[model samples]
Target: LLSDKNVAIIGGGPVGLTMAKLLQQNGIDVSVYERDNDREARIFGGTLDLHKGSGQEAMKKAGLLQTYYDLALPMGVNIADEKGNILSTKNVKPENRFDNPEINRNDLRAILLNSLENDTVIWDRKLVMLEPGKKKWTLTFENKPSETADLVILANGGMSKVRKFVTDTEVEETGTFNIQADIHQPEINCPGFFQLCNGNRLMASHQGNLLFANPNNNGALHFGISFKTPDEWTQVDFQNRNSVVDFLLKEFSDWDERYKELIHTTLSFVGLATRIFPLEKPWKSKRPLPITMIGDAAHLMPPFAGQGVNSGLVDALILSDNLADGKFNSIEEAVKNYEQQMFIYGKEAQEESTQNEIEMFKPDFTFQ
Candidate 1:
């Protein structure tokens, strides 16, 4: 289907990079435009797990599943109380350890990035405009040179500027506000909370405040505190560590001491109001050329069920397969087919995430 076509993928995230590799494997000419300055740019995110059905399947097709397992860590789940008491524990076993191992954000990026051909990804190319010409699309970048491609795949992010060509429905907030903080040298900065989390992922909720902490996030202790909009989710500058720390301390003042220790000893913070792209409103079915989206660009879901990245991986898997040679007659057929399939599973994933947020943030919630 893409024999002589030059495909371009915007965004170097796991999903976008995976899409590029999958097409390259099928002998298609593809290029990835990344906003980051280079490969060494810092990735601000948490550890991600590639589940059996969705993420692993995509990696296997891209021929990097084993590499992922080699760099990933299998973390156990520790359900704890506000006072740092373990309520329940789910350990990773030898048989099921590889089922959904977690990998650091940078580590996962390196794995996919190292597999691609040289010059396959153009760094610092933040897409600013998409102009559909007679036979090709002209992509303009901010303060960067332009490039043309026979087909465009928008995997940049949820806030992509080109998404208006795909869907006009704006993003909606889910009323869940989250604060992401990192404690470098956890054992030195937050000893009590560090010991409580051990090497497993910790989950605790009290008085409607929730905490999910991971001890091995890129060699630092990374955690997020989530809740319904307790106060106006406004004017909180996460980049200023002091402001975020004070805000968390005030809101979660009733939480246990160990929980406070994780907040006070934090060094960096990122805060956001959870958002969801309503899938009920249909995406634009009519594009001048072959253009579609995958990853968070395709479906934006909250992190409650941890289904955001996995579902995006599934999109890359389906889209690449549909565009492979001898699979479809035209690019339009392939893109439409993939979009139809995404709607079915996308809605199911968001529904599960919404239900989880409703119960998990409740004051009387339990792990079960």
Candidate 2:
């Protein structure tokens, strides 16, 4: 049935693109709608490790596993104290060196985008609305032409407005805030902090605050400081980088001077108010057309357990199998099967991430 069906994937993130590649490789015609102006748009974020069973599995199916390994870096973790003193280090064992390799977000995107046929992604098409059509669904975009498809996949992310088509669940803040910062030329700018990292990831926790730093990028050291939001804490103008720096300084005043130095030399900083869409409430659609959500759009969770992307990849993996496996009699059956399995696994991943979030805020927490 999918042979002649027109499919549109909303969101061009890693999962979305991976979904497109998986389907396209199986002789399915699909198009991806991305909000960014073009592929060159800056993608800001940290490195991500593709877990063996989830992310790496999807890459293997997509036939891009070697490419991922080529562009990725294999590193370990270092636990540090508030004084910036290294407490412990966990290096990737020789036997499991490739089990979980870290890849920059941009590099991963490049691999997926390059694997697809030209014109598979339509850039700058920010989806604004979804309307039911005769035997199809119409997708309206911001300042762009609308298109209809027999099936629509919602992978637009946590802030997706199209989520209403899938479920009425509301997104809720998790009462945690993260101040993400980046230091360029870490070796020359922040040698002490750089040395602490030791060419890998460094993590520290103190006074209910958590700090994680990694030097997996080209010449930049990226890190994020996370803490439970104070009850009376008010929002600040995120556009003001200086204000963010000051706020971070006060928050980590008692932390090690090396961490403070890292903050002081930050080339850029941004704030992320963490939020999650609970997976306990099953999402179902009464629509006539084949419609479903995957990735962050389906199950938004904290990054504490590194399950956000991994779970999303698993969604792509299973969903593609269901739709293309020919075991289901109808598209709806395929979707329903995928949804049922997604809830079971998504809920478990969310719970693990939530537990990690809670543990990270405890005074006795460690980066285990």
Candidate 3:
């Protein structure tokens, strides 16, 4: 079924790139459309820990496990209190170090992109709409020409617009907001906060407010403050660094002076309204042609569980296996089979993530 078919993967993220690599290794042609101008656009986000069973399994299948091991770093966890005092620390045991190693988002992208064939990813192509064609699908981009493909895979992420065609389930906010910030040269700029992290993932929670800090990259520190989205908090414009810092300062006024200093020294801030697209609702389409979703597009859950990317990688693995296995006579049947399996495991992942989020904000919650 794939011999005469053209495959297009929307979104050049880790999952999208992995999907492309998996198909390409099997001599299946695929293209990834990305919104970023190029690979050097900017650091994508914070570090990610790929679990052994899901993410690491996909990497091993894609023949890039060693490459991921070379680029990834193992990080420990440090739990702290509001006064910046270390409560406990948990280091990864030597035997389990490779079980879940942390890697920067950009670094992970580089390894995946390098493993793909030439010109596999077409950068700067922002998908605007998907138009059904005679026997295929036409993908319209924001500033690029349209392309048609026999199969379209949506790996663009949670806020993907293409999701409307596959499912009617609305993406719902989990009543929480994360104020993300980055500090460059943290060793000098934010000494106290840097020392508190101690080269590990630092976590703190007080009165339903949560803070997580990680020094994963060289000379840079990434952290976020998460809490229930307050009515008054929405009034402040997050674009203005001063406004965000002021809000954080007041929010943690009674906590620690060093915490305030971390906010004060922040150069920029980004606000993310935590949301999840429930997988409990069926996502299969009635269309005869092959069109499906993977990764965040298929099942978007909070980052608390760290299952978002891992589950997406599993999607790539299973979907590619079904499509290339040659067991199904038609592409629709293969896609249906994949969706059936995804519905079972994906819903369980989302439910676990949702429960973790609820517990994360509890007053007596502790980061393990």
Candidate 4:
């Protein structure tokens, strides 16, 4: 057991922050180094539904269940068909609602951040490399100064640099290119298409292509288009904005007019969809250091199941319990246990999500 050791957590996402809070509650001092300087430095992405068995259960253990529920948007799900036809409408199961409530990414982060003490998170510290020290690990950051800690936990997302330090595993590429675009006030800016959406989420898929739309916290709209494309598609440069839009217009030509106008509206943000290929087998190191990993840094999957963040919270809870108990005297043994369990958990979720994606685009699709 690590009786008296300094711990450092990399990344400040929900999983990272949740791990920090859980560890700190057990009297384990951990310093969270985040790449972003502030909360709004980057787009936290769309709303996420926290699963009851994973996300909500973990928060309850951390003593933040009520706080999270108070800030959660549990009644926001309104699913529509490809032609903007309402298929199903309900509040969703009350227990299931909080289990996977639609909460703002930034709002959740703020709540997790507020649960910490003074200056627990070290912002603007982008991790570059992790070196082995005499009794601790030396973390190299892009902006801030480096420091040595007895334990280092990599909670960074899929594109994690610290991953190499633990194992020589590589990220396998999924043959898909998903693009996200954020548009403002679609109802007014783009009238006909906005009327069809009805302030709810619309989803349609045909010929392996998917179209999704959801209203933002503001009265704006977020448009997302996904299709199977060559991996090198992002490498080529479009001469200007019009070039990209024209390409999208041609690609989505067969879609209905109501959905077609979503692409023509003003776009405010854009991002690529990427998923990580995890290790085929459980990772175990003979000589174990205090360095470890969690979240996407540990296991990343596509957004098909929306279980990535929720699963990470589960990792935090299990790790916290193992570390707090101090049962195993051997550090390697304790970590091996964590890795084995993580591999099982991650593999299950990853496979399920992949299958969900495959079914989502199938011709005969319906709510299961």
lDDT of 3: 0.86
Judge candidate 2 against the unseen true structure and give its global Cα lDDT, from 0 to 1: 0.87
| Predicted candidate 3 versus true structure: per-residue lDDT over 1-368, tens digit per residue | 59977899999989999999999988898999999999887864688878888899999999988888888777777888887556654554774446668888888999999999899999999999998878989999997799999999999989988776678887899889988888888988888888888888888899889998887564579998999889764687887888787878888988887788889888888999999988766764687567999999888899898788988999999999998989999888888898999888888998898899999987688765
Clashing pairs in model 3, backbone N/Cα/C closer than 3 A = none
* Runs of candidate 1 exceeding 4 Å displacement: 90-92
For each of the candidates, the C-alpha root-mean-square deviation to the true structure, in angstroms, is 1.4, 1.4, 1.5, 2.4
List, residue by residue over 1-368, the lDDT tens digit for candidate 2: 59779789999999999999999888888999999999888788888889888899999999989889898888777888887555654554673436668888889999999999999999999999999888999999988899999999998999888877778998899989988877888888888889888887889998888999987575678899899997867556678767777878888999878888988888677888899989867676586678999999999999899888888998999999988978999999898999999899999999999998998897788765
Q: lDDT of each prediction vs. the true structure?
A: 0.87, 0.87, 0.86, 0.74
After superposition, the stretches of candidate 2 with alpha carbons farther than 4 Å from their true spots are: 84-86, 90-93
Question: Candidate 1 lDDT, tens digit per residue, 307-348?
Answer: 988999999999989998567889989998999999999999
TM-score of 2: 0.96
List runs of model 3 lying over 4 Å from the truth. 84-87, 90-93
TM-score of each: 0.96, 0.96, 0.96, 0.91
The TM-score, computed over Cα atoms with residue i paired to residue i, of candidate 4 is 0.91
Q: After superposition, how far is residue 245 of candidate 1 from its true place, in Å?
A: 2.2
Candidate 4 C-alpha lDDT tens digits along 1-368:
55678789998999999999988888888889998977667443667667778888878888888888777755444455445565645455655445655677777888888998778898889889888877778888886688888888889888886676687787766656676766676767778766765655666676566777666544457667776665456653344556667777777777777766776775543646556657575564643477778888888888877788988999998888778788877665666677778888889999888888777766566543
Which is better, 1 or 3, measured by lDDT? 1
Q: Please give the distance, in angstroms, between residue 48's alpha carbon in candidate 2 and its true position after superposition.
A: 0.9
